[PDB]
Design a protein around this nucleic acid. Structure first.
Ligand SMILES: [Mg+2]
Ligand SMILES: [Mg+2]
Ligand SMILES: [Mg+2]
Lengths: 345, 345, 69, 207
DNA sequence: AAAATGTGACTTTACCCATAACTTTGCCGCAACG
DNA sequence: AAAATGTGACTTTACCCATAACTTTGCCGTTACT
């Protein structure tokens, strides 16, 4: 499309005006920080300023993209800046539709513009950003899943499953260093400067706008939490509510009429020692079994541990096939021997 | 706090209010609005008041539907007191009276007292609101209320419950395998054998497995400890045993003293203190024991046992083969099987 | 006939001390709840009250299958 | 028979179609009709077709949703046959094996035979299709399967089950009363007394 | 005379995916009236 | 060598009547603007 007249800019006239949210699956393998077993490949969420091509915030998770994978990048952006873009643009579908994302946006007077069905030309800048990220950082990492594009050529000598040594924390540090220091200072060919310099100039022209300042307190943290697919849970006796195979407990569950009742839940994906439930018309904190084991730890590693444990639980749920196979082999010879011993008698 | 008092559907309704108001707060009202003028005016006025007082207008749009509702009791207070007394002194008793008879007695007492009698639904609803430790202990006893026990949830991090390292906390437990065993020479019914387990509570690993027909005594502990020393080389640092008389003896205590073994004693009728090995007994039952001829599963309800399905006439296994296959299970199948709370075998 | 046993359980027998009701769950029995230490009834009085129930309590009670006592 | 093939939801939908078409059948069509013209015309045409070649035209407005669906089995036939055989010969057996172990054995056999292995949910769902008397008798025994045995439902007037008059059919049965008794004099426990009941089947009166 | 051990293998709802099967409904022609 | 007995007492939903504690509306008074 060609812009004959001078309409509203597609990139913006000042920073933070349009924040494009996009997602990519890294061509890399990640192992546990305590065992070394290959978890898999992660998902990164990039929030890029359309005006300055600056990566304001990033989010790392092992899950497929959805509203929880962008509320996280929004809260990270608020953590590092304290303001939200007035036009936070997200994707269409059902994984990006919820009732807490839009409530968060309506709290701070923000506007949401979803993509049209199967048309990403509005966020076409994110496509080149993903290409640059893959061809500048991702493909330059040991054990990158570059040969996985040709499954027929994936030999055990060059298999990234037994090659990559990258971990969630170390690769997170490397990704942040590449995105916020190398990319943020490297000149972009679009506007002909570095993203940081363009952002500084745009903020100088547009001021600070202190009315959009948000205090990064605990209330905001609860304001930016996702919810499981069902949205409710059953209160078991003495145990609590199950979220991602973890039982979160609150003393409010001791009420006789709340037992085994369906209660609305919310889960923090940056720490798994704390969730929230709705009891007696009040949101109440629920403590898991990972709270004592992670009491006294800063928030800069709680999220790493939580994501790693989530992926570990998913892989354990996947291990049931091998468990059943071994049980079947053992039981087969039990039967064999049993039949032989009966025939002997 | 006002926000945190609301519910998810309150969030949705306040969001609907916000999307109704926002076009009016942008100078571009819609040409087709279902909401009338007065309602949108009220919502806009509340938005303005909230944005002019609390610094955030969305809080004005909250409904807080939990605050509305008739939380007042409808029965007279004398009836409530008399029904509470009857529940306390005629239903929570060591008689297990049915609800109908105690309700009838309550109604007769009410009719003598001249107070308004309640309905059977009222009695059932107030009995299901007093459920818990008190009811189960004043009805069936302490061993039945033990299922309705409050768990222990760690706020701070004491010494870990299952172990900081292997061979730190190890559990001893006996049981009788639900399988009828036959003799290897004369082929008569030898009854059900007894299996004793020594489990490393950290990795839940079966350190030692022993099987013998005799009732548990110091001989079983002797054999299990000798097996544990033979297979690995060292006894567990803290041996956790139950209050059985075979552990409160003179041989076991001096045996543990000789090898610098801290002996821990779980309180009587509190099996949760051995939640690792005891659950592993059920794992053995479902994975190896209950898949064998003569599995005394039907005998749980002896009313359904027939001479054709009595396991005694079906018994085929001997002691040696059952022990050797249970050892094969313990040291290879459960050994290599991945664990939930361990993320590896 | 057989269900008339169960009614005798609910209306007369399970509402007495020392009833053998909690022994269905043998795994949950303690010396403080054993009916052999709580029992106080005798054969004569138990028979007398069972006859009373069967002859003037259940006898005058309306039946669902007859719409009459 | 078409009416007998209808559901209450299908009946309500037919009622809605009739209420939509009724103004068009009286010369007073409404000026506010949300339903498009093509559907109204099709409903009217089928109304006339039914009133012509059936006898009543309402019966031409029946949906019969029950026929719709994909009942074709999605698993390969060899997979079926193997899983039938394993459910027959490794689950309903005098072992009371759990479903996970039998599914694992079936999966191992399928991988030996080079066929598709059904998921665990499929195994549980088909096992749930075999419930009743046969499975309970082939797993627990004839005593346990007796609950789901059968009810003999009277078609004609045979001799009544519970007699015709008092003192016609009386049942005799004994039981062990669930009550402990102490000795009258010495106070020692004596056990649980036995109760013998003779009761007529007509008036239920404990004889 | 006295505080601190639930647990994990197995099974079951729930959401998505593909296809069969009846009903909708805009896009076009065709007969009838002004 | 073989027909042809499930009950019913004691619970648990499920719907209706009453009232609290607010949202949801119309309607009229008031006021800025033309
Ligand atoms: Mg034991
Ligand atoms: Mg047992
Ligand atoms: Mg009895």
């Amino acid at each position: 499309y060609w812009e004959l007249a001078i309409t509203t800019p597609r990139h913006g006239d000042r920073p933070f005006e349009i924040g494009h949210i996009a997602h990519t699956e890294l061509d890399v393998e990640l192992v546990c920080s305590d065992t070394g077993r290959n978890l898999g490949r992660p998902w990164a969420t990039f929030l890029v300023d359309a005006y300055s091509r600056r990566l304001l915030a990033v989010y790392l998770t092992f899950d497929s993209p959805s509203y929880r994978s962008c509320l996280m990048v929004l809260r990270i952006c608020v953590k590092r800046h304290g303001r939200l873009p007035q036009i936070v643009v997200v994707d269409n579908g059902a994984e990006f539709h919820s009732v807490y994302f839009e409530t968060l946006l309506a709290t701070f007077e923000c506007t949401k513009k979803q993509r049209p069905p199967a048309k990403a030309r509005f966020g076409s800048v994110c496509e080149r950003l993903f290409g640059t990220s893959n061809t500048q950082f991702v493909h330059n990492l040991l054990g990158n899943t570059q040969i996985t594009r040709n499954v027929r050529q994936v030999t055990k000598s060059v298999n990234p499953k037994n090659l990559a040594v990258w971990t969630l924390g170390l690769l997170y540090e490397y990704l942040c260093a590449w995105a916020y220091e190398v990319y943020d200072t490297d000149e972009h060919p679009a506007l002909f400067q570095s993203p940081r310099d363009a952002f500084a100039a745009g903020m100088a022209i547009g001021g600070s706008r202190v009315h959009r300042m948000i205090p990064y307190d605990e209330n905001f943290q609860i304001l930016t939490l996702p919810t499981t697919s069902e949205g409710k849970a059953k209160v078991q006796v003495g145990r609590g509510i199950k979220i991602n195979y973890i039982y979160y407990w609150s003393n409010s569950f001791r009420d006789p009429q709340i037992e085994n009742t369906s209660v609305q839940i919310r889960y923090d994906p940056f720490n798994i020692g704390i969730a929230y439930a709705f009891v007696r018309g009040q949101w109440v904190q629920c403590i898991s079994q990972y709270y004592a084991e992670l009491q006294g730890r800063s928030e800069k590693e709680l999220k790493l541990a939580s994501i790693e444990l989530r992926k570990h639980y998913s892989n354990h749920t996947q291990q049931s096939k091998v468990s059943a196979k071994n049980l079947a082999e053992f039981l087969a010879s039990v039967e064999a021997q049993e039949a032989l011993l009966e025939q002997r008698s | 706090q006002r926000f945190h008092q609301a519910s998810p559907e309150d969030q949705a309704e306040a969001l609907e209010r916000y999307k109704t108001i926002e076009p009016y707060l942008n100078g571009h009202p819609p040409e087709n609005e279902t909401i009338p003028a007065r309602t949108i005016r009220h919502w806009k006025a509340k938005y303005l008041i909230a944005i002019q007082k609390y610094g955030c207008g969305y809080i004005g749009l909250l409904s807080h539907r939990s605050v509305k509702g008739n939380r007042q009791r409808k029965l007279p207070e004398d009836t409530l007191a008399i029904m509470e007394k009857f529940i306390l002194e005629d239903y929570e008793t060591l008689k297990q009276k049915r609800m109908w008879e105690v309700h009838a007695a309550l109604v007769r007492a009410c009719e003598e007292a001249g107070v308004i009698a309640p309905s059977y639904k009222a009695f059932t609803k107030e009995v299901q609101r007093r459920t818990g430790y008190e009811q189960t202990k004043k009805r069936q006893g302490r061993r039945a209320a033990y299922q309705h026990e409050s768990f222990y949830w760690e706020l701070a991090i004491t010494t870990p419950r299952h172990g900081d390292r292997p061979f730190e906390i190890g559990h001893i437990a006996h049981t009788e395998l639900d399988v009828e065993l036959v003799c290897s020479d004369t082929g008569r019914n030898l009854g059900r054998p007894w299996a004793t387990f020594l489990v490393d509570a950290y990795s839940r690993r079966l350190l030692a497995v022993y099987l013998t027909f005799d009732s548990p005594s110091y001989r079983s502990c002797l054999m299990v400890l000798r097996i544990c020393v033979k297979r690995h080389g060292r006894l567990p640092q803290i041996v956790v045993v139950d209050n059985g008389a075979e552990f409160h003896s003179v041989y076991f205590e001096t045996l543990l003293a000789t090898f610098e073994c801290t002996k821990k004693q779980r309180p009587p009728a509190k099996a949760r203190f051995g939640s690792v090995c005891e659950r592993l007994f059920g794992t053995s039952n479902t994975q190896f024991v209950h898949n064998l001829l003569g599995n005394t599963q039907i005998t749980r309800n002896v009313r359904q046992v027939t001479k054709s399905v009595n396991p005694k006439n079906l018994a085929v296994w001997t002691l040696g083969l059952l022990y050797e296959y249970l050892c094969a299970w313990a040291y290879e199948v459960y050994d290599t099987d991945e664990h939930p709370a361990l993320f590896q075998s």
